[PDB]
mmCIF file of all heavy atoms in Angstrom:
data_model
loop_
_atom_site.group_PDB
_atom_site.id
_atom_site.type_symbol
_atom_site.label_atom_id
_atom_site.label_comp_id
_atom_site.label_asym_id
_atom_site.label_seq_id
_atom_site.Cartn_x
_atom_site.Cartn_y
_atom_site.Cartn_z
ATOM 1 N N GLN X 563 9.147 7.156 -10.072
ATOM 2 C CA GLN X 563 9.231 8.637 -10.132
ATOM 3 C C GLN X 563 7.799 9.198 -10.340
ATOM 4 O O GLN X 563 7.011 8.571 -11.178
ATOM 5 C CB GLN X 563 10.198 9.105 -11.228
ATOM 6 C CG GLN X 563 10.337 10.573 -11.222
ATOM 7 C CD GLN X 563 11.025 11.131 -9.986
ATOM 8 O OE1 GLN X 563 11.961 10.537 -9.496
ATOM 9 N NE2 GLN X 563 10.538 12.298 -9.555
ATOM 10 N N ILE X 564 7.441 10.196 -9.508
ATOM 11 C CA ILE X 564 6.124 10.696 -9.386
ATOM 12 C C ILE X 564 6.002 12.084 -9.752
ATOM 13 O O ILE X 564 4.996 12.522 -10.541
ATOM 14 C CB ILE X 564 5.596 10.410 -8.039
ATOM 15 C CG1 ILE X 564 5.683 8.896 -7.610
ATOM 16 C CG2 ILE X 564 4.189 10.943 -7.787
ATOM 17 C CD1 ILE X 564 4.925 7.982 -8.511
ATOM 18 N N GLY X 565 6.875 12.931 -9.332
ATOM 19 C CA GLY X 565 6.898 14.321 -9.641
ATOM 20 C C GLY X 565 8.148 14.635 -10.520
ATOM 21 O O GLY X 565 8.989 13.861 -10.837
ATOM 22 N N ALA X 566 8.359 15.889 -10.797
ATOM 23 C CA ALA X 566 9.323 16.380 -11.728
ATOM 24 C C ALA X 566 10.647 16.554 -10.969
ATOM 25 O O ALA X 566 11.753 16.394 -11.709
ATOM 26 C CB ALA X 566 8.923 17.722 -12.324
ATOM 27 N N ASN X 567 10.707 16.750 -9.740
ATOM 28 C CA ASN X 567 11.920 17.179 -9.030
ATOM 29 C C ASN X 567 12.458 16.042 -8.214
ATOM 30 O O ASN X 567 11.887 14.967 -8.153
ATOM 31 C CB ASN X 567 11.594 18.358 -8.115
ATOM 32 C CG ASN X 567 11.332 19.604 -8.955
ATOM 33 O OD1 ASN X 567 11.970 19.914 -9.909
ATOM 34 N ND2 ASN X 567 10.325 20.411 -8.518
ATOM 35 N N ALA X 568 13.568 16.270 -7.607
ATOM 36 C CA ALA X 568 14.199 15.304 -6.683
ATOM 37 C C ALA X 568 13.296 14.823 -5.656
ATOM 38 O O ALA X 568 12.464 15.565 -5.159
ATOM 39 C CB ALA X 568 15.499 15.879 -6.103
ATOM 40 N N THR X 569 13.328 13.538 -5.375
ATOM 41 C CA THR X 569 12.620 12.910 -4.206
ATOM 42 C C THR X 569 11.244 12.744 -4.485
ATOM 43 O O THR X 569 10.463 12.077 -3.661
ATOM 44 C CB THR X 569 13.016 13.628 -2.948
ATOM 45 O OG1 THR X 569 14.388 13.683 -2.750
ATOM 46 C CG2 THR X 569 12.402 13.072 -1.777
ATOM 47 N N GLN X 570 10.681 13.413 -5.512
ATOM 48 C CA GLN X 570 9.198 13.207 -5.740
ATOM 49 C C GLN X 570 8.949 11.808 -6.355
ATOM 50 O O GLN X 570 8.800 11.621 -7.524
ATOM 51 C CB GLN X 570 8.700 14.321 -6.676
ATOM 52 C CG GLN X 570 8.895 15.660 -6.069
ATOM 53 C CD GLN X 570 8.579 16.845 -6.898
ATOM 54 O OE1 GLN X 570 8.400 16.733 -8.061
ATOM 55 N NE2 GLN X 570 8.472 18.035 -6.235
ATOM 56 N N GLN X 571 8.951 10.841 -5.440
ATOM 57 C CA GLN X 571 8.975 9.421 -5.819
ATOM 58 C C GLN X 571 8.429 8.641 -4.614
ATOM 59 O O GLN X 571 8.074 9.210 -3.591
ATOM 60 C CB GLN X 571 10.373 8.978 -6.147
ATOM 61 C CG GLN X 571 11.372 9.088 -5.014
ATOM 62 C CD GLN X 571 12.743 8.833 -5.456
ATOM 63 O OE1 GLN X 571 13.086 8.570 -6.600
ATOM 64 N NE2 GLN X 571 13.655 8.788 -4.487
ATOM 65 N N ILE X 572 8.261 7.313 -4.751
ATOM 66 C CA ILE X 572 7.699 6.412 -3.771
ATOM 67 C C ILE X 572 8.546 5.150 -3.666
ATOM 68 O O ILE X 572 9.598 5.115 -4.268
ATOM 69 C CB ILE X 572 6.232 6.105 -4.001
ATOM 70 C CG1 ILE X 572 6.047 5.442 -5.369
ATOM 71 C CG2 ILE X 572 5.396 7.407 -4.066
ATOM 72 C CD1 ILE X 572 4.652 4.859 -5.603
ATOM 73 N N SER X 573 8.017 4.234 -2.828
ATOM 74 C CA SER X 573 8.659 2.916 -2.758
ATOM 75 C C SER X 573 7.613 1.878 -2.812
ATOM 76 O O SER X 573 6.430 2.107 -2.452
ATOM 77 C CB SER X 573 9.401 2.758 -1.450
ATOM 78 O OG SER X 573 9.953 1.463 -1.369
ATOM 79 N N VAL X 574 7.894 0.704 -3.453
ATOM 80 C CA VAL X 574 6.986 -0.430 -3.559
ATOM 81 C C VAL X 574 7.741 -1.676 -3.344
ATOM 82 O O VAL X 574 8.939 -1.783 -3.594
ATOM 83 C CB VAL X 574 6.305 -0.346 -5.011
ATOM 84 C CG1 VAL X 574 5.418 -1.549 -5.277
ATOM 85 C CG2 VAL X 574 5.516 0.873 -5.232
ATOM 86 N N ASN X 575 6.994 -2.668 -2.798
ATOM 87 C CA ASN X 575 7.511 -4.001 -2.653
ATOM 88 C C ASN X 575 6.433 -5.055 -2.876
ATOM 89 O O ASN X 575 5.313 -4.783 -2.996
ATOM 90 C CB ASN X 575 8.053 -4.218 -1.259
ATOM 91 C CG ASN X 575 9.275 -3.330 -0.914
ATOM 92 O OD1 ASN X 575 9.159 -2.542 -0.037
ATOM 93 N ND2 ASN X 575 10.305 -3.554 -1.633
ATOM 94 N N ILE X 576 6.896 -6.310 -3.031
ATOM 95 C CA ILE X 576 5.916 -7.405 -3.346
ATOM 96 C C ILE X 576 6.615 -8.734 -3.134
ATOM 97 O O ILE X 576 7.865 -8.951 -3.411
ATOM 98 C CB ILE X 576 5.429 -7.269 -4.729
ATOM 99 C CG1 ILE X 576 4.272 -8.282 -4.958
ATOM 100 C CG2 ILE X 576 6.464 -7.407 -5.796
ATOM 101 C CD1 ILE X 576 3.339 -7.981 -6.131
ATOM 102 N N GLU X 577 5.812 -9.774 -2.602
ATOM 103 C CA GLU X 577 6.344 -11.110 -2.595
ATOM 104 C C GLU X 577 5.210 -12.126 -2.569
ATOM 105 O O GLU X 577 4.295 -12.044 -1.621
ATOM 106 C CB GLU X 577 7.224 -11.405 -1.430
ATOM 107 C CG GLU X 577 7.845 -12.818 -1.395
ATOM 108 C CD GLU X 577 8.801 -12.990 -0.214
ATOM 109 O OE1 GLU X 577 8.963 -12.085 0.518
ATOM 110 O OE2 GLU X 577 9.270 -14.185 -0.129
ATOM 111 N N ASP X 578 5.125 -13.046 -3.534
ATOM 112 C CA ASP X 578 4.304 -14.264 -3.450
ATOM 113 C C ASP X 578 4.939 -15.295 -4.325
ATOM 114 O O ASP X 578 5.470 -14.966 -5.399
ATOM 115 C CB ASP X 578 2.856 -14.039 -3.866
ATOM 116 C CG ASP X 578 1.977 -13.345 -2.825
ATOM 117 O OD1 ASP X 578 2.112 -13.661 -1.689
ATOM 118 O OD2 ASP X 578 1.182 -12.478 -3.225
ATOM 119 N N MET X 579 4.840 -16.516 -3.923
ATOM 120 C CA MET X 579 5.389 -17.651 -4.624
ATOM 121 C C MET X 579 4.744 -18.907 -3.977
ATOM 122 O O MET X 579 3.797 -18.898 -3.197
ATOM 123 C CB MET X 579 6.917 -17.661 -4.571
ATOM 124 C CG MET X 579 7.557 -17.820 -3.174
ATOM 125 S SD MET X 579 9.317 -17.654 -3.236
ATOM 126 C CE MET X 579 9.506 -15.907 -3.554
ATOM 127 N N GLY X 580 5.323 -20.087 -4.252
ATOM 128 C CA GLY X 580 5.004 -21.333 -3.539
ATOM 129 C C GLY X 580 5.168 -21.182 -2.045
ATOM 130 O O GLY X 580 4.176 -21.397 -1.406
ATOM 131 N N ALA X 581 6.314 -20.777 -1.592
ATOM 132 C CA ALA X 581 6.535 -20.551 -0.123
ATOM 133 C C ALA X 581 6.053 -19.143 0.174
ATOM 134 O O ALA X 581 6.873 -18.203 0.352
ATOM 135 C CB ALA X 581 8.000 -20.763 0.167
ATOM 136 N N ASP X 582 4.721 -18.959 0.183
ATOM 137 C CA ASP X 582 4.032 -17.744 0.658
ATOM 138 C C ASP X 582 3.085 -18.022 1.786
ATOM 139 O O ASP X 582 2.179 -17.201 2.028
ATOM 140 C CB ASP X 582 3.418 -17.012 -0.494
ATOM 141 C CG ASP X 582 2.250 -17.821 -1.044
ATOM 142 O OD1 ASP X 582 1.990 -18.949 -0.689
ATOM 143 O OD2 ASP X 582 1.537 -17.168 -1.952
ATOM 144 N N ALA X 583 3.246 -19.148 2.441
ATOM 145 C CA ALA X 583 2.415 -19.486 3.657
ATOM 146 C C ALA X 583 2.907 -18.635 4.825
ATOM 147 O O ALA X 583 3.685 -17.720 4.606
ATOM 148 C CB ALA X 583 2.363 -20.979 3.899
ATOM 149 N N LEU X 584 2.363 -18.951 6.044
ATOM 150 C CA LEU X 584 2.616 -18.081 7.195
ATOM 151 C C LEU X 584 4.014 -17.697 7.445
ATOM 152 O O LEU X 584 4.889 -18.529 7.632
ATOM 153 C CB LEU X 584 1.941 -18.771 8.433
ATOM 154 C CG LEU X 584 1.921 -18.008 9.660
ATOM 155 C CD1 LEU X 584 1.113 -16.759 9.636
ATOM 156 C CD2 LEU X 584 1.504 -18.994 10.753
ATOM 157 N N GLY X 585 4.263 -16.374 7.473
ATOM 158 C CA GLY X 585 5.557 -15.826 7.434
ATOM 159 C C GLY X 585 5.941 -15.266 8.788
ATOM 160 O O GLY X 585 5.389 -14.227 9.248
ATOM 161 N N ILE X 586 6.907 -15.868 9.462
ATOM 162 C CA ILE X 586 7.440 -15.324 10.681
ATOM 163 C C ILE X 586 8.478 -14.304 10.432
ATOM 164 O O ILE X 586 8.294 -13.077 10.513
ATOM 165 C CB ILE X 586 8.007 -16.453 11.605
ATOM 166 C CG1 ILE X 586 6.879 -17.480 11.900
ATOM 167 C CG2 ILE X 586 8.530 -15.919 12.912
ATOM 168 C CD1 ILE X 586 5.637 -16.953 12.587
ATOM 169 N N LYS X 587 9.707 -14.753 9.996
ATOM 170 C CA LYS X 587 10.713 -13.922 9.367
ATOM 171 C C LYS X 587 11.131 -14.700 8.033
ATOM 172 O O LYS X 587 11.279 -14.080 6.933
ATOM 173 C CB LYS X 587 11.851 -13.664 10.218
ATOM 174 C CG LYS X 587 11.474 -12.894 11.470
ATOM 175 C CD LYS X 587 10.987 -11.480 11.159
ATOM 176 C CE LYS X 587 10.633 -10.732 12.472
ATOM 177 N NZ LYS X 587 10.142 -9.320 12.060
ATOM 178 N N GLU X 588 11.362 -15.960 8.258
ATOM 179 C CA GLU X 588 11.256 -16.944 7.177
ATOM 180 C C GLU X 588 9.869 -17.424 7.230
ATOM 181 O O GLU X 588 9.083 -16.971 8.080
ATOM 182 C CB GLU X 588 12.302 -18.027 7.364
ATOM 183 C CG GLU X 588 12.453 -19.039 6.222
ATOM 184 C CD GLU X 588 13.596 -20.062 6.448
ATOM 185 O OE1 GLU X 588 14.389 -19.857 7.447
ATOM 186 O OE2 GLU X 588 13.870 -20.900 5.559
ATOM 187 N N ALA X 589 9.469 -18.286 6.292
ATOM 188 C CA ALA X 589 8.173 -18.888 6.361
ATOM 189 C C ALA X 589 8.021 -19.673 7.679
ATOM 190 O O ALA X 589 7.383 -19.180 8.618
ATOM 191 C CB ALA X 589 7.909 -19.787 5.218
ATOM 192 N N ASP X 590 8.582 -20.826 7.728
ATOM 193 C CA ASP X 590 8.937 -21.671 8.925
ATOM 194 C C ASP X 590 9.572 -22.825 8.409
ATOM 195 O O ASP X 590 9.884 -22.962 7.218
ATOM 196 C CB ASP X 590 7.677 -21.930 9.779
ATOM 197 C CG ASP X 590 7.970 -22.363 11.225
ATOM 198 O OD1 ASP X 590 9.112 -22.464 11.544
ATOM 199 O OD2 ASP X 590 7.050 -22.533 11.952
ATOM 200 N N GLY X 591 9.817 -23.908 9.170
ATOM 201 C CA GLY X 591 10.361 -25.134 8.740
ATOM 202 C C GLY X 591 9.401 -26.150 8.258
ATOM 203 O O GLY X 591 8.824 -26.016 7.176
ATOM 204 N N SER X 592 9.080 -27.183 9.092
ATOM 205 C CA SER X 592 8.154 -28.217 8.616
ATOM 206 C C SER X 592 6.772 -27.646 8.467
ATOM 207 O O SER X 592 6.008 -28.335 7.809
ATOM 208 C CB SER X 592 8.107 -29.355 9.748
ATOM 209 O OG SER X 592 7.518 -28.779 10.978
ATOM 210 N N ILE X 593 6.451 -26.460 8.993
ATOM 211 C CA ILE X 593 5.143 -25.827 8.726
ATOM 212 C C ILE X 593 5.292 -24.547 8.028
ATOM 213 O O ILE X 593 6.466 -24.188 7.635
ATOM 214 C CB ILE X 593 4.391 -25.677 10.147
ATOM 215 C CG1 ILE X 593 5.182 -24.732 11.010
ATOM 216 C CG2 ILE X 593 4.113 -26.965 10.796
ATOM 217 C CD1 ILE X 593 4.436 -24.198 12.245
ATOM 218 N N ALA X 594 4.187 -23.966 7.705
ATOM 219 C CA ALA X 594 4.083 -22.636 7.067
ATOM 220 C C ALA X 594 4.827 -22.366 5.797
ATOM 221 O O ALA X 594 4.961 -21.249 5.407
ATOM 222 C CB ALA X 594 4.555 -21.617 8.145
ATOM 223 N N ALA X 595 5.420 -23.475 5.193
ATOM 224 C CA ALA X 595 5.949 -23.401 3.887
ATOM 225 C C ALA X 595 5.328 -24.400 2.970
ATOM 226 O O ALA X 595 4.893 -24.121 1.868
ATOM 227 C CB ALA X 595 7.461 -23.673 3.992
ATOM 228 N N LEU X 596 5.272 -25.686 3.455
ATOM 229 C CA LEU X 596 4.611 -26.751 2.625
ATOM 230 C C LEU X 596 3.205 -26.497 2.404
ATOM 231 O O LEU X 596 2.590 -26.830 1.363
ATOM 232 C CB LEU X 596 4.891 -28.120 3.234
ATOM 233 C CG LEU X 596 4.375 -28.419 4.678
ATOM 234 C CD1 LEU X 596 2.989 -28.906 4.752
ATOM 235 C CD2 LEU X 596 5.293 -29.550 5.275
ATOM 236 N N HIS X 597 2.476 -25.860 3.386
ATOM 237 C CA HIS X 597 1.091 -25.702 3.341
ATOM 238 C C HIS X 597 0.552 -24.988 2.087
ATOM 239 O O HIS X 597 -0.393 -25.339 1.500
ATOM 240 C CB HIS X 597 0.643 -24.944 4.599
ATOM 241 C CG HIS X 597 0.785 -25.649 5.867
ATOM 242 N ND1 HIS X 597 1.986 -25.567 6.546
ATOM 243 C CD2 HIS X 597 -0.001 -26.467 6.533
ATOM 244 C CE1 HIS X 597 1.878 -26.375 7.675
ATOM 245 N NE2 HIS X 597 0.761 -26.865 7.615
ATOM 246 N N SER X 598 1.412 -24.081 1.595
ATOM 247 C CA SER X 598 1.207 -23.608 0.275
ATOM 248 C C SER X 598 1.817 -24.448 -0.765
ATOM 249 O O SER X 598 1.306 -24.841 -1.809
ATOM 250 C CB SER X 598 1.759 -22.162 0.148
ATOM 251 O OG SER X 598 0.981 -21.286 0.881
ATOM 252 N N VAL X 599 3.075 -25.005 -0.414
ATOM 253 C CA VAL X 599 3.818 -25.832 -1.377
ATOM 254 C C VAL X 599 3.360 -27.189 -1.485
ATOM 255 O O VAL X 599 2.716 -27.536 -2.458
ATOM 256 C CB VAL X 599 5.311 -25.693 -1.130
ATOM 257 C CG1 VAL X 599 6.169 -26.516 -2.083
ATOM 258 C CG2 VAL X 599 5.841 -24.231 -1.229
ATOM 259 N N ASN X 600 3.581 -27.977 -0.383
ATOM 260 C CA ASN X 600 3.179 -29.370 -0.379
ATOM 261 C C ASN X 600 2.122 -29.581 0.648
ATOM 262 O O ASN X 600 2.386 -29.451 1.861
ATOM 263 C CB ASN X 600 4.352 -30.281 -0.096
ATOM 264 C CG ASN X 600 5.419 -30.288 -1.225
ATOM 265 O OD1 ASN X 600 5.039 -30.321 -2.368
ATOM 266 N ND2 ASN X 600 6.655 -30.356 -0.849
ATOM 267 N N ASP X 601 0.905 -29.880 0.262
ATOM 268 C CA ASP X 601 -0.150 -30.041 1.233
ATOM 269 C C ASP X 601 0.150 -31.324 2.018
ATOM 270 O O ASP X 601 0.845 -32.201 1.630
ATOM 271 C CB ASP X 601 -1.501 -30.158 0.593
ATOM 272 C CG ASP X 601 -2.680 -30.189 1.571
ATOM 273 O OD1 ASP X 601 -2.345 -30.230 2.840
ATOM 274 O OD2 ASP X 601 -3.805 -30.285 1.127
ATOM 275 N N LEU X 602 -0.322 -31.356 3.293
ATOM 276 C CA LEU X 602 -0.377 -32.568 4.113
ATOM 277 C C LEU X 602 -1.401 -33.512 3.603
ATOM 278 O O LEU X 602 -1.560 -34.589 4.275
ATOM 279 C CB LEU X 602 -0.713 -32.138 5.539
ATOM 280 C CG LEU X 602 0.378 -31.259 6.237
ATOM 281 C CD1 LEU X 602 -0.253 -30.944 7.496
ATOM 282 C CD2 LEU X 602 1.675 -32.104 6.439
ATOM 283 N N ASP X 603 -2.167 -33.296 2.517
ATOM 284 C CA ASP X 603 -3.312 -34.056 2.166
ATOM 285 C C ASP X 603 -2.808 -35.338 1.409
ATOM 286 O O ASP X 603 -3.443 -35.615 0.294
ATOM 287 C CB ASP X 603 -4.237 -33.145 1.326
ATOM 288 C CG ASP X 603 -5.560 -33.870 1.080
ATOM 289 O OD1 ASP X 603 -5.791 -34.938 1.503
ATOM 290 O OD2 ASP X 603 -6.395 -33.169 0.504
#
């Protein structure tokens, strides 16, 4: 809530975690999830 009256407000979102590598709609399968979570190294 930002102002005194109705609708005087905003929207916010956020996401980061282990599976925050390259995001298509899901991260991906064998790729783009482990790279943050489990390295290939």
Side-chain angles (χ1 to χ4, degrees):
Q563 184 65 40
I564 301 300
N567 291 319
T569 304
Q570 294 176 351
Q571 64 188 2
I572 61 169
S573 178
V574 175
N575 296 115
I576 190 165
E577 184 177 0
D578 282 320
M579 64 184 74
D582 64 355
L584 181 64
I586 301 299
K587 299 292 183 182
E588 185 173 1
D590 197 357
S592 67
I593 61 170
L596 61 84
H597 294 88
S598 292
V599 176
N600 291 321
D601 186 358
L602 296 173
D603 190 359

